[PDB]
Design an enzyme around this catalytic site. Structure first.
Site, PDB file in Angstrom:
ATOM      1  N   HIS A  36      20.320  29.692  13.281  1.00 37.02           N
ATOM      2  CA  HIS A  36      20.838  30.318  12.042  1.00 37.02           C
ATOM      3  C   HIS A  36      20.489  29.513  10.789  1.00 37.02           C
ATOM      4  O   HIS A  36      20.208  30.107   9.792  1.00 37.02           O
ATOM      5  CB  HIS A  36      22.359  30.434  12.100  1.00 37.02           C
ATOM      6  CG  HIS A  36      22.990  30.712  10.768  1.00 37.02           C
ATOM      7  ND1 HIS A  36      22.682  31.795  10.008  1.00 37.02           N
ATOM      8  CD2 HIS A  36      23.934  30.048  10.074  1.00 37.02           C
ATOM      9  CE1 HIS A  36      23.383  31.756   8.904  1.00 37.02           C
ATOM     10  NE2 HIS A  36      24.145  30.717   8.914  1.00 37.02           N
ATOM     11  N   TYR A  49      29.733  35.630  14.314  1.00 34.64           N
ATOM     12  CA  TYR A  49      30.156  36.886  13.702  1.00 34.64           C
ATOM     13  C   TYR A  49      31.503  37.294  14.275  1.00 34.64           C
ATOM     14  O   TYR A  49      31.643  37.442  15.493  1.00 34.64           O
ATOM     15  CB  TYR A  49      29.126  37.980  13.989  1.00 34.64           C
ATOM     16  CG  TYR A  49      27.908  38.018  13.107  1.00 34.64           C
ATOM     17  CD1 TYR A  49      27.448  36.877  12.455  1.00 34.64           C
ATOM     18  CD2 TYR A  49      27.199  39.205  12.947  1.00 34.64           C
ATOM     19  CE1 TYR A  49      26.304  36.927  11.662  1.00 34.64           C
ATOM     20  CE2 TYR A  49      26.072  39.270  12.170  1.00 34.64           C
ATOM     21  CZ  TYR A  49      25.622  38.129  11.532  1.00 34.64           C
ATOM     22  OH  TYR A  49      24.497  38.207  10.751  1.00 34.64           O
TER      23      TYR A  49
END
Ligand SMILES: COc1ccc2c(C(=S)N(C)CC(=O)O)cccc2c1C(F)(F)F
Length: 275
Positions: free
Chosen positions: A118, A59
């Protein structure tokens, strides 16, 4: 007020709305131009009750974790539930532990509450990745482990290859995206003590007209927005928690209010029938 639900079978309750941080401090690459404003937004969210914080190493190219790391210093670490994730190129043992260590350095904290894969990487054996995550748990660097974007069959495989309990599967799930229903994934989670964490829980644009018309009627009856109804629909389901993208104070307030909505049994059946 924030709705809480048990995570997995941990005996621990977490906020059923997580704070989605994608875009805070950049998306794929770091953006430093709004750092002060973003730290203030994170603190405002946490003060409102968004103590469950969802982020990842990638991120903002790492910068989102850095901004969270500054915001959380205004709070007691043990009051926060911080989730991070590892990108599928880092799932080999040494790479995963390095990703974990660097996530902790950027957050400037001694542990994450929940660490997720993820996305699956078929080239890297799940047993290796999960064993490395268990090393993190044994060292006190991770409290709980989970997966993300695993379908039912892969979640079952992960459970069979994991020393530690898999407490959640974070997948895309909303009023129009019913893949977790059609895959039997939601039912599997409900019957096996796994929390289904719905990301992209709001579909803000490009809805079908039948979806819009149905949501508009139910929203009107509750004095709510269609987005609040979308969220309340997810939150009514056993084992389902949702991660709306934070965005701005108006969204944080509106989404928090969605926990006040009690959908009728008729309304739930109607919403269920949209996908
Ligand atoms: C690092 O790059 C990412 C990472 C995640 C995403 C996502 C997802 S799945 N999330 C932001 C949620 C998550 O990573 O948990 C959605 C769309 C594009 C993405 C991209 C990208 F923009 F490149 F396509």
């Amino acid at each position: 007020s924030m709705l809480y639900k048990e995570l997995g079978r941990t005996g621990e309750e977490i906020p059923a709305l997580g704070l989605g941080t994608w875009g805070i401090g950049g998306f794929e690459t770091p953006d430093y131009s709004r750092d002060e404003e973003m730290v203030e937004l994170l603190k405002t969210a946490i003060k409102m009750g968004y103590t469950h914080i969802d982020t990842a190493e990638y991120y903002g190219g790492g910068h989102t974790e850095e901004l969270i790391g500054k915001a959380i210093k205004d709070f007691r670490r043990e009051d926060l539930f911080i989730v991070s994730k590892v990108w599928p190129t880092h799932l080999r043992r040494d790479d995963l532990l390095r990703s974990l260590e660097n996530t902790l350095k950027r957050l400037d904290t001694d542990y994450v509450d929940l660490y997720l894969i993820h996305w699956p990487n078929p080239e890297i054996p799940l047993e290796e990745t999960l064993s490395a995550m268990a090393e993190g748990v044994r060292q006190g660097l991770i409290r709980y482990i989970g997966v993300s974007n695993f379908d039912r069959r892969l979640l079952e495989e992960a459970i069979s290859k994991s020393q530690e309990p898999i407490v959640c599967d974070q997948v895309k799930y909303n009023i129009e995206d019913r893949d977790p229903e059609r895959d039997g994934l939601l039912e599997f989670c409900q019957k096996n003590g796994v929390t289904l964490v719905a990301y992209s829980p709001l579909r803000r644009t490009l809805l079908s007209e039948k979806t819009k018309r149905t949501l508009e009627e139910i929203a009107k009856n509750h004095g709510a927005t269609i987005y609040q109804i979308m969220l309340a629909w997810l939150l009514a389901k056993p084992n389902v928690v949702a991660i709306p993208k934070a965005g701005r104070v108006e969204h944080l307030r509106e989404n928090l209010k969605a926990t006040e909505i009690k959908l009728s049994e008729e309304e739930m059946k109607l919403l269920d029938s949209l996908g």
